[PDB]
Amino acid sequence: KAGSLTIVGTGIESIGQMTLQALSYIEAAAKVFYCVIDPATEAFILTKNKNCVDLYQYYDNGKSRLNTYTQMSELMVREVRKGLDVVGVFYGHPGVFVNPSHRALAIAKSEGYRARMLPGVSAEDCLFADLCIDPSNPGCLTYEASDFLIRDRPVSIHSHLVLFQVGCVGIADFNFTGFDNNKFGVLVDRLEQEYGAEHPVVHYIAAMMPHQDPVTDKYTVAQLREPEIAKRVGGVSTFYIPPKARKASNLDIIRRLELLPAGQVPDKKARIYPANQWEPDVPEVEPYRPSDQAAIAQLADHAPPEQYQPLATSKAMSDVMTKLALDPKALADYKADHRAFAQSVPDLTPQERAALELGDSWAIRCAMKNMPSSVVGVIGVIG
Amino acid sequence: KAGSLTIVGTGIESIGQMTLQALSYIEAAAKVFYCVIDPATEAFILTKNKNCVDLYQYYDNGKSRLNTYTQMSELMVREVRKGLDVVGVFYGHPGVFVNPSHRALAIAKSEGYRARMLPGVSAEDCLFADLCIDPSNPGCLTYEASDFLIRDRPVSIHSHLVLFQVGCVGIADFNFTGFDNNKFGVLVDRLEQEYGAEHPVVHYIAAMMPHQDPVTDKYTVAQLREPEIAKRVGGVSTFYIPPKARKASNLDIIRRLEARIYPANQWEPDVPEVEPYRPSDQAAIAQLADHAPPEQYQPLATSKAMSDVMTKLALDPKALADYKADHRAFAQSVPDLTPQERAALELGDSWAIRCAMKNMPSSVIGVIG
Ligand SMILES: Nc1ncnc2c1ncn2[C@@H]1O[C@H](CSCC[C@H](N)C(=O)O)[C@@H](O)[C@H]1O
Ligand SMILES: Nc1ncnc2c1ncn2[C@@H]1O[C@H](CSCC[C@H](N)C(=O)O)[C@@H](O)[C@H]1O
Secondary structure, eight states: OOOOEEEEEBBTTTTSSSSSHHHHHHHOSEEEEOOOOOOHHHHHHHHHSEEEGGGGOOOOOTTTTTHHHHHHHHHHHHHHTOOEEEEEEEEEEETTSSSSHHHHHHHHHHHHHOOEEEEOOOHHHHHHHTTOOOOTTTTTEEEEEHHHTTOOOOOTTTSSSEEEEETTTTTTSOOOOOSOOTTTHHHHHHHHHHOOTTTTEEEOOOOOSSOOOOOEEEEETTTGGGGHHHHHHHHHHEEEEESSSSSOHHHHHHHHTTTTTTOOOOOOOOOOOSOTTTTTTTTOOSSSOHHHHHHHHHHHHOOSSSSSBBBBBOOOHHHHHHHHHHHHHHHHHHHOOOOHHHHHHHTTOOHHHHHHHOOOOHHHHHHHOOOOOOOOOOOOOOO | OOEEEEEEOOOOTTTTBBBHHHHHHHOOOOOEOOOSOHHHHHHHHHHHHSSSSGGGOOOOOOOHHHHHHHHHHHHHHHHHHHHHHHEEEEBOTSSOOOHHHHHHHHHHTTOOOOOEOOOOHHHHHHHHHHHTTTBTTTTTTEHHHHHHHHHTTOOTTTEEEEEEOOOTTTTTTTOOOOOOOTTHHHHHHHHHHHHOOSSSSEEOOSSSSTTTOEEEEEEGGGGGGSHHHHTOOTTEEEEEEEOSSSOOOHHHHHHHOOOOOSSSSSTSOOOOOSSSSSHHHHHOOOOOOOOOOOOOOBBOOOOHHHHHHHHHHHHHHHHHHHHHHHHHHHHHTTTTTOHHHHHHHOOOOOOHHHHHBBOOOOOOOOOOO
């Protein structure tokens, strides 16, 4: 069947946080539907495709968001049924707290059209970067604020907590001026029950324009009841709640994992630098210790290991691999006939020519780097 | 004070998943430090800046990663101390399950230099897109697999669970050939204990090359004890465990405040099919017949010169620096803006620039969730 739907994101900050593939698919699209919240990004989109319709006009005062979301999705699928290659655009990540994207893709799939979502940079990604925290340490809980209340979602006082849509608690509608967030007190009551009146809450707004600074204002739970503070929390506000304390290691698991043998007890409180700047009364960890200093001393005599594989490729091969990532029409051709496409690319080496015809990951990477005398695998664990 | 450190990401799929701002900062850098795991992306970066060093060479067989990570961070901050503007590059999101970026920035921050991280597209972002799930519904738990076991982190059977680094449970070092993931069974035991033997677990590997398909294989917890299946789990493997059931509403809270949504989670066990066009949907679709923009709706109405300059600030890191360094001189230096546009750039306030670019009727909200 002719016709496809691809949904892409623009990221949070104006223009700069759009990915290269999102841009290339927008330019190649036959018609574009977008929902963005900054004018420079909107104007930028209109420079890349002449046949765009702004989905934001389907919100309205006192109109259920469900009705808006249903309308948005059908407009996209209508152009798919006419056999056209359609691109939908939502700011941030288009599948993160976005109802209409999943709806439209699922309909297109069930009806038999090609359908794919390309990921983007979400508001939580911005949060990790600007607050300088990692979801790995000590885990991350992510909830919708109203759902968090209505279905009593468990807190974990030892992990990160991220809450979206704190500016429209219990509110199912839209209003152009703003929300009367008069049920905000119900969230605050729950956070006090779970965390205590003096536990920190960080009010986070990622910068939308390139020259702006983010807001990273630290409050207590109790401070959130004061009227002048509550009204600063709006439609682009997210909360970050840091852990209350550190969870103890399970002795039986350390033994089963063989990190310690039969009779040994782990070094409690061994903390990895750096410490969470937001956790209350978290102590200072020293960036340089004897163990750190000895690792640094080896930097003097360090040379590349034997089995380290430096990149060794060609202009033709780099160019074609770049082209596949940035040229959707070239990618479709290669996927149509791996061999035929590879035969038309000039100046590849024989090993390059065989790797491209196969297209397998193992063959091409061996083709593009130098092999130390010893099939080659993939390991990127920096966490 | 002179010297800065900017850390950026490349996303997961080669090249295409890099952000525009990541590219411009790489090109502008005095020195570039990169850590990527695909060859096309490495080659692409090396064309865009001519002073790069590959950090990957500080791993080694049998070497603790903590030693490598301290080395990676020290290499960068030493050049910052010389007063240089340096950018570090890590694949995916440069702050998601990556240790040395925070360390290097924290050292730089302690010594008084400007230090910033630019976000990228993580493997979890790819998971949501390829598995067609939304973190909003019904919430999402994300853990490091070894931490999950050692600290006995709580599960929630009604929310999404995502586990990173399942291919090296309990392994603190590195090897070029591969991990012998022989403690994987302790993790499988925990999953059986929490969800039961027949609950689904989807093994996910996002495509790294643009022509590749993702791995999206659905297995029961019990099949993960077969040898031939366990060896499939490697250094780029992530697990998604879907919810077992739907949690009841709090009857107290619903009234204190003033049936499933299509579509259903395809991966949940024993969850019924939903109708996409219920009658309430069809009435909203009926509203298609005659619709116009609302009265307070603000259509975009800007100029080429204005759109161009705001774009330049997003795509030219030095121009941004010049603007931030001196609002007054830059705004007046730009030709062809109207009187309210140049004044709006001199101000820099969010409200002013927006008024200059949008038609306001006679008189920031983006909730699609
Ligand atoms: N600039 C910003 N800074 C912090 N949070 C933001 C934000 N913009 C939107 N959000 C959050 O996202 C919610 C809207 S739902 C849209 C989210 C978007 N798809 C994304 O990828 O992030 C808001 O209620 C708010 O909680
Ligand atoms: N292609 C892929 N598909 C699924 N998970 C992946 C992946 N590549 C890396 N990962 C996950 O990331 C871990 C490495 S730690 C690096 C994570 C990276 N910074 C990011 O933003 O995603 C791996 O153990 C694996 O769980």
